[PDB]
Design a binder for this molecule. Structure first.
Ligand SMILES: O[C@@H]1[C@@H](O)[C@H](O[C@@H]2CO[C@@H](O[C@@H]3CO[C@@H](O)[C@H](O)[C@H]3O)[C@H](O)[C@H]2O)OC[C@H]1O
Length: 189
């Protein structure tokens, strides 16, 4: 298991963050593989990918994803200037992260329609410190734990709708939890 932070493992960038509550272990495996095991966690996000990401990467993911409670499985990353936290959500647990959010469009990609949303975080942790920032979401209608994500289809649809991204920071396939339990084993490429 590893220490919250960022770095490289077997050629892949990783990021593992948590709120300090406990109840979650993150492990880096061979190649693009990582695993998460959590029991009565707080808020955490971990996974493997790239630093920096790109606006036209085709990302593959494969494995198992077994949340018990509030959790997401997504292509996840940030842009700077403007600061944006973004998600291409392929699966989730008890909570659709777009609940109560205003729908800003649809995009069809990689075998499913996705619904597009913008939300806002206020005085929340980020890659540059505590801040207020927008989040962009593509939420897949057909849930899955393996597949291919053509990120350009999402970024282009977001930009079309006025959801523009700045300079890309990291870009990973992430398991996120918010006060839940679960297990996951995911291989990225
Ligand atoms: O040391 C700093 C790290 O702690 C910092 O990490 C980022 C902190 O914010 C995390 O984003 C949250 C993830 O969960 C979502 O539900 C919330 O909306 C976000 O606030 C992000 O994942 C971490 O990378 O990065 C900068 C370091 O100095």
């Amino acid at each position: 298991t590893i220490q919250p932070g960022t770095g490289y493992n077997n050629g892949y960038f990783y990021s593992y963050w948590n709120d300090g509550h406990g109840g979650v272990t993150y492990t880096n495996g061979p190649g693009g593989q990582f695993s998460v095991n959590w029991s009565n966690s707080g808020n955490f996000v971990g996974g493997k990918g790239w630093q920096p990401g790109t606006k036209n990467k085709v990302i593959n993911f494969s494995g198992s994803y077994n949340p018990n409670g509030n959790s997401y499985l997504s292509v996840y990353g940030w842009s700077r200037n403007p600061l944006i936290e973004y998600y291409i959500v392929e699966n989730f647990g008890t909570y659709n992260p777009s609940t109560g959010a205003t729908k800003l469009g649809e995009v069809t990609s990689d075998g499913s329609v996705y619904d597009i949303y913008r939300t806002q975080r206020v005085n929340q942790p980020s890659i540059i410190g505590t801040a207020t920032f927008y989040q962009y979401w593509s939420v897949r209608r057909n849930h899955r734990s393996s597949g291919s994500v053509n990120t350009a289809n999402h970024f282009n649809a977001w930009a079309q709708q006025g959801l523009t991204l700045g300079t890309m920071d990291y870009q990973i396939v992430a398991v996120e939890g918010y006060f839940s339990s679960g297990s996951a084993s995911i291989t990225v490429s």
